[PDB]
Amino acid sequence: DNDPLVVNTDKGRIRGITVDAPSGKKVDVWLGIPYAQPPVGPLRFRHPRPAEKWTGVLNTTTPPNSCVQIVDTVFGDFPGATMWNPNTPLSEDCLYINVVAPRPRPKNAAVMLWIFGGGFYSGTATLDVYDHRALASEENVIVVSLQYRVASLGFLFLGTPEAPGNAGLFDQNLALRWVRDNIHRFGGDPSRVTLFGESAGAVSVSLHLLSALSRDLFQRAILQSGSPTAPWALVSREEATLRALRLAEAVGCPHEPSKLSDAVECLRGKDPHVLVNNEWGTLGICEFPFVPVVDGAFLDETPQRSLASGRFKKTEILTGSNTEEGYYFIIYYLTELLRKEEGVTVTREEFLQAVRELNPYVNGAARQAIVFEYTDWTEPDNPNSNRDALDKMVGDYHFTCNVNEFAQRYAEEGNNVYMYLYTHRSKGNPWPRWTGVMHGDEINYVFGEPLNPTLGYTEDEKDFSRKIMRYWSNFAKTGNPNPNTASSEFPEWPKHTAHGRHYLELGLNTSFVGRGPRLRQCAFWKKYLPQLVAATS
Amino acid sequence: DNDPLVVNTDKGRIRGITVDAPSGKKVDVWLGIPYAQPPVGPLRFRHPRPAEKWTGVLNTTTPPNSCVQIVDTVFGDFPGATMWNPNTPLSEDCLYINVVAPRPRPKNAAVMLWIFGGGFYSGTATLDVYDHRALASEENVIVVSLQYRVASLGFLFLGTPEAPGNAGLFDQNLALRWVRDNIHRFGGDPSRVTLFGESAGAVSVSLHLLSALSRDLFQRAILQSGSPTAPWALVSREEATLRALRLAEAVGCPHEPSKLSDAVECLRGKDPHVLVNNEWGTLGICEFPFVPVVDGAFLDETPQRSLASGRFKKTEILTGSNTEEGYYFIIYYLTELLRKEEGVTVTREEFLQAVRELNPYVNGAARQAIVFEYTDWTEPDNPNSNRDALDKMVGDYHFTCNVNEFAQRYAEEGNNVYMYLYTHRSKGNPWPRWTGVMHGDEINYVFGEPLNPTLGYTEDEKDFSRKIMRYWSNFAKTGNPNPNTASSEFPEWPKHTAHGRHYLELGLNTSFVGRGPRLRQCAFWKKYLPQLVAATS
Ligand SMILES: *[C@@H]1O[C@H](CO)[C@@H](O)[C@H](O[C@@H]2O[C@H](CO)[C@@H](O)[C@H](O)[C@H]2NC(C)=O)[C@H]1NC(C)=O
Ligand SMILES: *[C@@H]1O[C@H](CO)[C@@H](O)[C@H](O[C@@H]2O[C@H](CO)[C@@H](O)[C@H](O)[C@H]2NC(C)=O)[C@H]1NC(C)=O
Ligand SMILES: [N+]
Ligand SMILES: [N+]
């Protein structure tokens, strides 16, 4: 074949299609390249098998199925809630990759691989927000995305080999090995693969930096609002087995800890949709029913012990938090208070009740430590203050501080870190104004969604998008986000060093460099509060 | 008589002298007017008696004796230390008043009454720092100062009428009633007397605001770096009696808690100096052996309870702190760490040990609550941060926070309050640069010492002194430190309201208005830590 759009992968030939980006610039896309045997029937819960080789030319030309998950119907057809909802048909047969190359096609260029996040229970590579075409065209990078199994279908653990856990991670791993073996034919460099993800995607990206198996499969990592040391990232395998048996019971299957073989077999028989819909029960804020576990294969120790011993890939890291990480999660959980409407406020009575519900595992001397740390003492009863106080305590404990820890441990092991604090509200944000810059607002801007002429992004926001797209891209290219010739419209990004802890604020009219961010609160959660609960128990 | 320099005081007549001020302007001074029968012999430890009438005229021209006290000598003949050492012969006969009037003599001027503060163990009205001549001439106000018995000689408590306690406070009280009777003859209005003091002197004027016997003796109050709720201000009756018997035991007297009249009789025999030198046993930082006690007459309840119930004089108060209150007392206490050297620093290990030596009563969980609250979490190990940390944790608990509490409590009850933060370090400072603006640095500017050209104060400092002398003065006059016109040279000083809690920063180039000061830390000491120590035993 002399036809550029056909590519001969290790398992067969595939045909892509030439499409315009929203920006107008033309790119070459390959949608739904199968990288694994569909994990159906006997293969459910288990690790993926490589794809069977196919005879002829396969048209990899249609956005692939998204994996079986719940749909967010709590706010109805609210555009802020539905943008995260899967936009393709749901199927167990969902293990597919997407490749987008720029035109003119490069001979050998950087590869930016996007692992999506949804708290390991939801998400798809096919979301309209993850605009591959805009990033690939504007930065000259091969943009790659993968679909991995999610929820119980991707992370069920029972201790047995028929449910060994981390299926979704081995899905990602296998997909990385595919990129290694094939990305050169699309014009990428199998040695310059940069993994980048948000939330559970960032947790995944970080787990690949830790993992023994996916170690030599990529070069660099960008981690948006996530780290492997986060509370929700992993569960004890003692708990994971219980969550699984409680799900077995909930769907009407044998749930005896002795006959675990009876459990998996029955579970393999049930409909995937009823399976993913009965996972939720008594769960606190920011804790998800089925997530990664320390299995022995992908991870043989907790991320804590991995970070401590310094056992992680020696590479550059770009990482950062948003200003209001918590709000999003405090809206869904704790729904009666803090509802979806403008100008909502929290009383001192309600704040005191919330810290009890948002931290239901601390003895009470610790709750007082929290109420003191997360209260504005210049005006202790202020209704706005007591609301924003809730966002910070959730945002710090579950997100911002875990990101900080990871970045710091990489920094003192002698690796170049680049820390950001994303502080920009989109002018047409559908959410109430009090939410501010929430969890995963940067995603639109990193994917060049403002450049879409059919959308109402301002001229300033279009610059800001191109700005952070460059930062991200040439980090994936060079290992450093700064321009080679040191520009002024592109401010400097100091290295997040162990002793200095410097971060760059990402907003419209700023080049501000701070330290942390939020150092006092992180020391509260990491240093002070643990030794208090020890002293009071 | 027709000589202006002689005045017919109710108990006799006195002759003063006209003398120049450092400003060049002249004033009339009366120095060492006896307001009480000398508290010698059987009258030691007891409340003062009014002085006997004298025939003829009395030369009140030379500065009076200072009360028997310990002499600071740990830094030898060092300018920083010696300025607080007594500058007149030490005598048990020391109860005298000083009156300084401007020229030309006013008819019914405002009266500013200065109560000195040497931590209730030291001090004298005669100190060159307190020189009244400048304040009187420059602000056109008659300035008064009193001597009160200090240390055990003025504050020995046993519970018996022989040693009832608060002799020094009754010394102060009798001086107030003297002012009311006689101040009109000097050109003062006995209805508009405002008390102002610093440290122990400030907690003295605060106790007059609380006392039943003092409430109709003055009009307003200025309280520099002191409040009646300060931990060092009062001691329990149990302690005060045990402190007394230990003084009896150390000096070689009967010390049995059965027969107390044997102890006091013996103590009346011993030398005044041998008595004040042996009172210093094992006392923590900012702990003074002989201080005011809730006796029954001068105070019949703790200032804590008196503040809670709102039982204090309805009147305007002007109060505030310095930035480095703690350093002074640490310098003397922790003598081996942070000595009187230039550029001294504290290691993290030395800081962790210091918090135990500075808070020797908290359990251990509370020690850790302190170390967390007083760590610069930007650079947790920084030698400068860890040294400055010691100043703050001492200065807050013992000074700043208690001043805040009193000011707010007065404001809450509907009284007009004016809070200051004194941040100006004098250029010609004898102490090392790291000490900053220490306890009692404001005194020099309050009394107009920069207006003495022989002391070489800078031109901006000369204006700064006139600025704060005015604030103080027209507060004593009007009840508000602001002038009528409000020009740029005299910035606005907003009221310290219950919810606002505004303070004016008193520095050279500044005009800044803040909240507090140091709200989070006062909330730490008044709210969090007390409830933490209770939860942990
Ligand atoms: C897409 O893949 C299908 C088979 O799944 C393949 O048939 C298409 O090629 C086209 O096949 C048509 C036969 O029904 C034929 O009419 C058409 O000419 C042919 N196109 C070409 C270029 O040979 C695949 N699409 C494309 C664009 O080839
Ligand atoms: C001050 O009080 C003394 C008390 O003895 C008094 O003596 C002074 O008056 C002066 O007294 C002197 C007696 O030695 C006498 O020589 C002198 O004339 C007299 N001074 C006069 C009248 O001006 C008192 N002060 C003053 C200045 O008299
Ligand atoms: N999300
Ligand atoms: N002092």
Please tell me about this protein's structure.
Chains A, B: It is found in: Synapse. Chains A, B: This is Acetylcholinesterase. Chains A, B: Rapidly hydrolyzes choline released into the synapse. Two copies of one chain form a homodimer. By secondary structure, chain A is an alpha/beta fold. Chain A has a single domain, classed as 3-Layer(aba) Sandwich (Rossmann fold), CATH 3.40.50. Chain A is built from 16 helices and 14 strands. In chain A, the strands form two sheets. Chain A has an eleven-stranded mixed sheet, sandwiched between helices. In chain A, strands 1-2-5 form a three-stranded mixed sheet, with no helix packed on it. The longest helix of chain A has 29 residues. The structure holds a molecule of 2 linked components (NAG-NAG) (2 copies) and ammonium ion (2 copies). One ammonium ion (NH4) binds next to loops of chain B.
Short description:
Chains A, B: Glycans are attached at residues 59, 509. 2 copies of one chain form a homodimer. By secondary structure, the first copy, chain A, is of the alpha/beta class.
